[PDB]
Design a binder for this molecule. Structure first.
Ligand SMILES: *[C@@H]1O[C@H](CO)[C@@H](O[C@@H]2O[C@H](CO)[C@@H](O)[C@H](O)[C@H]2NC(C)=O)[C@H](O)[C@H]1NC(C)=O
Ligand SMILES: *[C@@H]1O[C@H](CO)[C@@H](O)[C@H](O)[C@H]1NC(C)=O
Ligand SMILES: *[C@@H]1O[C@H](CO)[C@@H](O)[C@H](O)[C@H]1NC(C)=O
Ligand SMILES: *[C@@H]1O[C@H](CO)[C@@H](O)[C@H](O)[C@H]1NC(C)=O
Ligand SMILES: *[C@@H]1O[C@H](CO)[C@@H](O)[C@H](O)[C@H]1NC(C)=O
Ligand SMILES: *[C@@H]1O[C@H](CO)[C@@H](O)[C@H](O)[C@H]1NC(C)=O
Ligand SMILES: *[C@@H]1O[C@H](CO)[C@@H](O)[C@H](O)[C@H]1NC(C)=O
Lengths: 143, 127, 108, 431, 124, 430, 129, 436
């Protein structure tokens, strides 16, 4: 397994930035992802959370309206738009991966055929808040 | 055979009533659930229902095994006002039943009471 | 904007016993499971405790943890020199975003 | 002076009843007519001669043909209930031409013995049996949007064997013997029996097949001889021959559709493809439409001209008959019905596999292809005609109904019941 | 046909036994589907109920008489009543309950009497 | 002195037999209660009075009510065997809200072929569809526990009188005591060849078209001191009732497969309204008090009327048929709440009926174009006690289906006549 | 089938006794859904019971014997059917062996009783003009 | 001197008619429509025809041709409203069962409650019930040749005795000769209204519950010197047999379409044990030593028993029924593996195999499916009769077990019955005319 992040670098106060997290060695559309941050000398802190398809998005209370998260089934990366950079935002931003896989239970079918593999209909399994794989992360710096 | 006996009665249907009583003598001297499996069953039950119906109707008034039996009902003059020489010598049986065809229910009822009344008077000869 | 009350640093001598606690509130741990993690100095974090009662196949039986009401406690036996690292507490619930708060860190 | 009763008087009155089958024992074949479960007949049937009697009976008001129509219909439904259907065959086809056209070589998807796998098979279907969605090309069966279609079993046959209708014990079937007795008329040479003669149940539209030549003086039976709807049923006295075949040598491919189902479709056509054709004799037929034209003139006092069929569909317009297990559809339009040495008339016929027989929207059959070379040699005894209107009178063939194929053989019969109880006055009282 | 005749016998259910022979006089002188198999099962059952009575009347002689008479002595153990008491103060339905358990022994005894009378006559 | 036999004596014995149909001369529509195969009736029937007779009858241990319920059940199975089944209809119905009880379902179905599909649309009532993920996507009510079939649109369900007539050799007794309930010995027994007209209807709460008592309201039951017995109430003065459907539906023929098709509701002409039944107010409170004075004479306690319990819409609802459209009317708390105007009755229509509450039975009734109006007629009632101990409460119960006919066959009993009689006399063979 | 089912088996006993003693030993001998496959076979059986009962009764009614058991018929016994005497038959034979010998002439013997009774009917009833 | 007729004469004639059911009034909806059958009488009255010798055949009988045609039409009447397993057989991805190894764990794809969607269930099937495709992935055994239907669990296959009774006017004769073989005249024939109890059991090699002979062993056959005709050996002092399966089974209802469902095999409580039968060897060895004594009497040469022929499984096994699960026992090489010349009851154990999808009466077109019976089944049955065939040696006549038809079972209970019709009309000369 290997998780690599992108979008990091030096930024200026008040500007914008979009982080990326390339996923590999596993089924991208079958696991949820989490974004964390840990200030130097402090503890970790959740940033955002997304499902396997991106229909459910959740963030922190302090970044409502400014921080967003989305994924893409054709390019397999996680986006995180960070606006209004603040000096208290410098932290160890990592890319997390959930463990619970959305195992499908009812696929769409076609009587008189029963051979065509149609998309899924009723899947089970959401986010659990457990990160089994942690990338190297990209360090951000604002001043 | 129930079928071969009802066909012999229909022989000589064009002869007069006076000669039909003796013509039958000279004619008898020389002598599983499919659609087809259900109509045969429905026909045998209909054959039995027609044989005893004409047989049980006889048993009500005296006659049970006879053929030329006589009854004790006086012949009216309103049902048929023709002489004996014309009925039994110049008319077939099919034509005769077209004349008295209306006096049928009034006759079968009169034949029954004329025989049931006989049993009451006969069995009262001991009291 | 909740926080997990944890000791910033505790003494860890080879052979003694170290307890790591995690006290929160009712909204974050009173109705949801709790987890645990370890972040060694200069290394990436890793999963240690999931579902509050199950452990991955990569860790020995020395790592153990439990919870009691609104507070959880981590009890580990067999302390060595290489175990001195930063341990965290973690709660997560999809209902409200006030339950997703990491621990402040426990340096052993 | 006294009433007396008689048992066994010849008194009868017509009524209705239920007649059963009767056929001599021959042999298992599992024919479509359940004669293996039918009572055998008698070698010497009773046929009395009723003298001095003139019974009058109607032909079109008869009820023996309404029970026969409700019998054959219920007979085919019995031999088709345990059959396999062609429901998984209502798939979009993809056809092309045949070898060195009315024969299409179609290919389609067909589910194998288990639903998870599908293979592409091919078969041969007649052009008269498939309809195009849009002429480009993709085709579809002709009965996949009206009702369900079933395939008859390959073991059962369509061979018309003679069956007798016998009245139950206590009834009597009258039978006339007059020479020139048409449909309705008081017959004087009346005779009684208990079982009908040889009745071969056949089907046809324009002509009659394997009938029974009654007597001389060809009869013209009808109901309203001065109308435009009543179908004239001619009854010939000198039948001519009609022979036709299928000069192809076709195989029988056994394809598989659905889990546990299969049907036999056309495979290869050995040799060159040739057209079926019937060979009604020429000189023997020309004098048949000359004796009829001299017999039908007397009932109209006009000269008559013959036109072709009307036109439109195939089951109601032109000839349609069965031959050895394969349903034919000829035209006979303007080869001998266009008039007023020893050559022969050759009629181009067409063959179909799916038949909407009995004139309903449902219960469509599918005759499997018979491998080999089918050959028949039948007789035609009587035609079916129909007026036009309007000088000269124009006649043309038309199967106005299907029951008329049986009124040509059940026209001299009448079912009655006997009442052997008689009443007559006499000079004999109860002693 | 066979139903209207059986219903006429019931017209004196409450009349006395001695008057039932004459009460019927003043009355006669006064005047393929589910059902295709249910009616078929009724016509067969109607014939079976009719000739079953017409059969017992054949084994005791007098197969066509209404008020018949047999040569069997009336045992004084089946009924301890008199003759004048039955035909004046008793109805036909009430009389059956007092004797209707001695029918299987009186139908067999009546059958032997007529069978014995046939052998004794044709021998002469 | 000697034994003699007697032919034709008035002796009858209780027995069981089969009774066939006997309809009137009015027949081609081919109803489910077929008449093209039922023997015609008799213009002048045979009936006579038995002088000085006393026969003990019984209603709850009768046989005709067990054969009639077993006869019409086989009648529906005969008329539904060659019909088309709605099996390919159990698809993911994407039903929006129609222009609130009727949903606009748009589903997928197969065309004339089997390799192509098209998007159709039809209207269904809320009672026939159940949700999978609401707010959407719906699904039919019984696509998991029973197979569903469709009634042939060429038949109808008119209640026509039929006569159950015993075979030749039997008799069907008939009591004429006008104050005679189910059990008890009758004293005016009259023998008839067979019964009068019996309209076969289906109802749960009330009792539609039937016969009256002509002398007084009769209260029939098997055990009045019980708690689960359905106390049948027979009336003598019938009340009027009318049920309508002001909506103007349209029939639409859609395709579901090769050779199979069914009819569903299309657009609705005119504004949408709700079905309702009417009952005269003065004519009801008067016909209810007369039962309050008769039912009190068997308990000597004050009585009050409650509504039904609830649950399924088959026992707490006045379920009845009307012109081929099944009606479910909520008659719970409009005249049964507590005890020149007109009492209304809001109803609701369902077209997927589980007949007789049997697994494996599901009939889809096709819609009927135009409005309907059934000027019905109430003749009887159905009640049910409660576990009381003071006052008493009675609720309209639905104990059984065969209980609907015991209010019509209460005065009938089939017997077997025996004409052979044995009696001692003084005679011998000459 | 409940009343006439045990009457045909009744006289089937004593089938080993002689002819002249069969009328005597039998005197002291009596000194002691509904539509399934079973429903259609029972209905098929009840018809065969009635068809086999009155068929014997229909043959007797045409011989002048309505319901009698032993009725003498006015027909002379032909010597060609049986050359044996009268005393030997009733004491040196049995009813089952009798059918194997004379039962082959059952066609002309069933019509001879008919003419000897039908002609006798009009000779008495129709003679009373 | 004069002709006279006689009514009621002892005259019969062999014929054929249609019989009907007759059973006790002890009434479940059994597979045999006994709840719609006429009850019998508590005292069957029969006569004793004295001093008469009647001969009747056993193989040319008609009651065996009517009983076999009745059961065939009776099963179809009880399987018509049954649900068919047409959507069952798909590409099954069967694997080995999680604990000699004749049961597999299969997981397939089936349509859910509504037709538009599908699911993935799991079930347990026997190795004898599935066949492989790539000779991994298995498929049902006989859904490529015919449609398959199951049996509703509301019915039972309990063999209850039925009486085949003749209509009024007919009499079913009955023999009483003790040593009466197949054909021949019975010197002690006695008439009866109809037969005794007949249990409709189905077996192929050893006859199950049935009537025992009175005096000695009877060897019935059509032609003993033939080579194809089966030799029915009737037994006296029958040997008991107990066939069990100490394994548990839990049924489970799975969905295979809208409104259709069938029960499969779920979990298995405890470990797997071989379903086997038990036979007391002391009584069995005492039996085969006697059957090998009378066959020598008719052949004048020594005889040996041998294993079954082989080939398929529906012919060379003891395919009987018990509890509701059709067994297939290896009744060879433990019974028929020895010859005959001149203590602690070591019970013989027969390893049996269970099969669900059975196509009885070798009729391709109908293959029934039996639901699994929860728990364990145990039936202590009787063995009254065997079926043996010859080979054609010569020496020594090698005998092999195995029937030749399915009608052969009922030819052992109907071996002393014959249907005849009575001709009560008689004709005899006397000295009496109609003038008295
Ligand atoms: C031949 O048919 C014609 C009509 O089709 C018959 O002519 C009339 O038939 C009706 C009965 O159908 C009779 O009542 C008339 O008396 C007939 N004659 C007229 C109207 O002039 C004609 O009778 C038939 N031929 C025979 C021999 O019966
Ligand atoms: C069909 O033609 C072939 C070719 O000559 C011939 O052998 C065959 O007999 C023909 N069929 C019939 C039925 O004669
Ligand atoms: C009739 O006799 C039977 C004998 O079985 C007896 O049980 C019954 O009580 C008797 N009935 C009367 C009314 O004496
Ligand atoms: C009416 O019913 C009561 C109780 O339900 C019962 O006691 C009585 O016998 C029945 N009949 C009459 C005439 O009262
Ligand atoms: C009910 O009353 C109406 C109103 O007159 C009447 O038309 C109807 O016939 C009555 N019901 C019956 C069953 O007679
Ligand atoms: C045989 O038995 C019958 C009936 O008992 C008897 O009449 C006959 O005499 C017996 N024959 C011998 C040899 O006794
Ligand atoms: C009886 O008659 C047949 C002819 O019907 C004859 O063949 C036979 O020899 C006769 N005698 C017998 C059967 O003893």
């Amino acid at each position: 397994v290997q998780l690599v992040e992108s979008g990091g670098g030096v930024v200026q106060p008040g500007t914008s930035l979009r982080l990326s997290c390339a996923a590999s060695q596993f089924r991208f559309d079958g696991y949820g992802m989490h974004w964390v941050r840990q200030a130097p000398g402090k503890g970790l802190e959740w940033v955002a959370s997304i499902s396997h398809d991106g229909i459910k998005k959740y963030h922190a209370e302090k970044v409502w309206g400014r921080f967003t998260i989305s994924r893409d089934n054709s390019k397999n990366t996680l986006y995180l738009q960070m606006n209004s950079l603040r000096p208290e935002d410098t932290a160890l931003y990592y890319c997390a991966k959930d463990l619970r896989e959305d195992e499908c239970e009812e696929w769409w079918s076609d009587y008189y055929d029963f051979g065509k593999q149609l998309p899924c209909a009723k899947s089970r399994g959401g986010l659990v808040g457990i990160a089994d794989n942690w990338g190297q992360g990209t360090m951000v710096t604002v001043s | 055979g129930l079928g071969a006996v009802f066909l012999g009665f229909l022989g000589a249907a064009g002869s007069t009533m006076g000669a039909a009583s003796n013509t039958l003598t000279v004619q008898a001297r020389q002598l599983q659930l499919g659609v087809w499996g259900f109509k045969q069953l429905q026909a045998r039950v209909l054959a039995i229902e027609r044989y005893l119906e004409v047989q049980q109707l006889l048993g009500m008034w005296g006659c049970s095994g006879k053929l030329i039996c006589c009854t004790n009902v006086p012949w009216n003059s309103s049902w048929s006002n023709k002489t004996y020489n014309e009925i039994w010598d110049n008319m077939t049986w099919m034509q005769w039943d077209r004349e008295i065809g209306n006096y049928t229910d009034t006759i079968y009822k009169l034949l029954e009471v004329s025989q049931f009344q006989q049993e009451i008077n006969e069995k009262d000869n001991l009291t | 904007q909740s926080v997990l009350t944890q000791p910033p640093s505790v003494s860890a001598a080879p052979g003694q016993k170290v307890t790591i606690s995690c006290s929160g509130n009712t909204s974050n741990i009173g109705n949801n499971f709790v987890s645990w993690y370890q972040q060694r100095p200069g290394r990436a974090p890793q999963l240690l405790i999931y579902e509050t009662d199950k452990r991955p196949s990569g860790i020995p039986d020395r790592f153990s943890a439990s919870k009691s009401g609104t507070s959880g406690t981590l009890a580990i036996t067999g302390l060595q020199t290489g175990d001195e690292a930063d341990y965290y507490c973690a709660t997560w619930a999809a209902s409200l975003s006030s339950a997703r708060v990491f621990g402040t860190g426990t340096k052993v | 002076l006294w009433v007396t009763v008689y048992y066994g008087v010849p008194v009868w009155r017509e009524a209705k009843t239920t007649l059963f089958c009767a056929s001599d024992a021959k042999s298992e074949v599992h024919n479509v007519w359940a004669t293996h479960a039918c009572v055998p007949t008698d070698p010497n049937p009773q046929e009395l001669v009723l003298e001095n009697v003139t019974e009058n009976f109607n032909m079109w008001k008869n009820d023996m043909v309404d029970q026969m129509h409700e019998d054959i219909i219920s007979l085919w439904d019995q031999s088709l209930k345990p059959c396999v259907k062609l429901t998984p065959l209502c798939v979009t086809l993809n056809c092309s031409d045949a070898k060195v056209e009315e024969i299409k070589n179609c290919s389609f998807n067909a589910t194998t013995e288990l639903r998870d796998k599908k293979r592409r098979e091919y078969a041969l279907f007649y052009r008269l049996d498939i309809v195009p969605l849009s002429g480009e090309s993709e085709y579809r069966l002709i009965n996949c949007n009206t009702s369900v279609i079933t395939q008859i079993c390959p073991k059962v046959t369509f061979d018309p064997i003679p069956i007798h209708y016998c009245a139950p014990a206590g009834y009597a079937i009258l039978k006339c013997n007059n020479k020139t007795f048409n449909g309705t008329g008081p017959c004087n040479n009346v005779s009684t029996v208990q079982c009908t003669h040889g009745i071969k149940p056949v089907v046809s539209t324009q002509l009659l097949l394997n009938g029974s030549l009654a007597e001389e003086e060809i009869i013209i039976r009808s109901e309203n001889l001065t109308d435009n709807v009543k179908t004239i049923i001619v009854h010939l006295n000198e039948s001519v021959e009609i022979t036709c075949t299928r000069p192809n040598n076709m195989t029988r491919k056994s394809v598989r559709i659905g889990p546990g189902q299969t049907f036999y479709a056309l495979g290869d056509i050995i040799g060159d493809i040739r057209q079926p054709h019937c060979n009604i004799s020429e000189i023997k037929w020309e004098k048949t439409l000359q004796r009829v034209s001299e017999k039908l003139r007397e009932h109209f006092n006009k000269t008559i001209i013959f036109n072709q069929s009307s036109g439109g569909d195939l089951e109601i317009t032109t000839h349609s008959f069965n031959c050895g297990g394969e349903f034919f559809y000829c035209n006979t339009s303007d080869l001998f019905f266009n008039k007023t040495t020893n050559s022969t008339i050759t009629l181009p016929c067409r063959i179909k596999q799916i038949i909407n027989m009995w004139q309903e929207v449902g219960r469509a059959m599918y005759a499997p292809p018979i491998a080999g070379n089918i050959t028949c040699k039948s007789n035609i005894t009587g035609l079916l005609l129909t007026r036009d209107g309007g000088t000269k009178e124009t006649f043309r063939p038309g199967g106005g109904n299907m029951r008329d194929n049986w009124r040509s053989e059940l026209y001299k019969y009448k079912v009655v019941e006997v009442k052997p109880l008689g009443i007559a006055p006499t000079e004999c009282n109860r002693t």
